[PDB]
């Protein structure tokens with residue numbers, strides 16, 4: 001549960 | 007509840023140390039993980055728990071310097087890590103040619119950002135090479151790519167370019183007119199800003215767009231008062247308790263910064279509900295290992311730990327430095343940068 | 353070929369076909385920061401990857417090595433770039449690569465590098481024939497996947513495949529009328545085809561939205577679309593809308609409706625309407641209704657809006 005911003 | 011400050015300092019300390027193979031997918035983004043940890047410690051006023059000198063050398067070892075013949079100017083900037091196998095060189099000797107070695111816009115950004123946070127004066131940064139590399143990343147439509155070899159292009163990188171130009175205090179790194187055009191064209195019918203024209207407006211791209219304009223000092227000049235009111239409306243509608251990045255999407259801790267910072271830049275964050283926001287952010291705090299997660303009872307990571315803290319900062323949390331909403335560094339650091347800039351001007 | 357989890361897997365350092373190549377190690381210097389620890393297998397694949405990269409070797413063995421490197425870390429953009437270089441150099445069957453990337457994206461639908469890779473392939477092939485269906489599948493495990501919608505708009509725009517999108521939208525909106533991504537897609541299609549200037553279309557759309565609003569009155573997306581397609585032509589220029597909304601207020605009320613009303617009133621004050629002082633009061637009355645009971649969380653915002661209207665029309 002994360003936010004891959006790249 | 008309360009803010010477990012010390013717990014978070016340990017968390018960031020560990021991030022700078024060693025990670026389980028489980029985080030292999032962050033290899034090419036290690037520099038931004040470093041940024042999350044360093045700027046995070048900075049925000050908690052604990053940079054003393056790390057050896058600034060060692061880290062500064064590591065960072066400089068990630069700079070893609072121009073070679074003797076300077077035939078690789080279009081590829082200069084910073085790497086996310088040493089994964090290419092190039093021999094350790096803290097920007098001491100000239101660049102060693104390599105068919106596939108070049109910078110990554112998000113790394114040039116977080117890299118410079120880290121150097122400033124650590125107190126370095128950027129003297130070892132080949133400013134012109136970086137700017138040359140930056141220019142090479144801009145497309146006809148005004149947006150940017152992350153690497154000269156090619157990649158997707160969107161608002162995320164427009165923000166990176168803006169931060170780079172701002173920190174190097176030189177906007178020759180981009181064609182500002184075209185960038186502004188891209189930012190305007192990204193505004194949706196619902197008035198938020200999307201990653202690109204026609205796409206769904208999003209909290210992340212709205213922050214990137216607005217912050218970029220503020221960094222260029224052209225917010226008021228690009229959007230009309232009527233437009234800014236519409237954007238403000240879209241942004242403030244993002245608060246449910248914490249903030250979500252898009253209408254009808256669940257809240258996520260990091261948006262307390264993405265959106266919150268945008269609201270701050272638009273001078274209306276003051277009209278949001280602080281308690282519910284703070285309460286939500288804290289509910290995602292890992293009381294055992296430290297740091298924050300996107301949702302409560304979820305595992306923490308460097309990104310949410312950092313943005314959750316910056317989110318708290320926006321509401322002047324007891325024990326956290328005020329964060330510069332457009333630059334994404336502590337105000338204290340944004341200041342040292344101001345001095346640094348004055349220095350050069352002589 | 354030789355899978356990374358095969359019982360008979362062999363480190364590259366022990367493979368005969370790779371005896372001539374000296375592996376290249378990664379070195380973070382004296383004091384490594386944010387250092388990730390790697391297993392023997394992992395470090396082995398990448399030590400050879402670095403070697404092949406450094407020499408820009410356009411070989412078939414290098415091409416196979418990238419498959420392993422990607423399995424170990426699909427977020428390594430350099431690996432994908434090199435793989436594309438090899439795809440060309442070795443003139444590999446791109447239709448085969450399409451199957452490969454299709455599987456990869458299904459496993460990692462939120463990876464930026466894999467979506468970029470697929471887009472490059474589709475450009476190369478100039479073949480969008482399987483895109484809309486592929487995306488529809490991905491949208492099945494997450495109807496709001498930003499990567500999926502972005503790719504979908506690129507395909508539709510690049511190969512002019514508008515013909516069935518408005519229908520696809522109607523279908524998804526039925527599955528979940530709250531999906532903000534679908535409402536955006538709807539505006540995307542229409543504004544890129546007929547446009548909203550055709551009063552026949554505008555009417556159809558406003559009617560369509562009011563219908564969706566009646567089904568689920570508390571839906572920011574629907575309200576944003578409605579206001580979106582009308583705000584620029586002038587909300588006050590639609591007298592029957594103001595009343596049709598005031599009629600909904602009784603049963604289908606929501607902060608979105610009240611907000612819309614405030615916006616209509618402000619457009620009026622903006623266009624020096626009749627009863628300047630009376631309209632402003634109707635607005636302020638609503639602003640306060642929002643602050644005190646309908647959208648309390650934004651209490652201070654609405655009061656700020658109200659104070660703004662007063663000092664602007666008095």
Ligand SMILES: CC(C)=CCC/C(C)=C/CC/C(C)=C/CCN(C)CCOP(=O)(O)OP(=O)(O)O
Nearest residue numbers: 003004005038162165210211251496497498499
């Ligand atoms: C390292 C650094 C500080 C970079 C700043 C510049 C960037 C890259 C900003 C990114 C902002 C952002 C939050 C973009 C959206 C990221 N996604 C997760 C996009 C698509 O995946 P979804 O799962 O649909 O995302 P969402 O989380 O919006 O629901």
Ligand SMILES: [Zn+2]
Nearest residue numbers: 003258260300
């Ligand atoms: Zn997040």
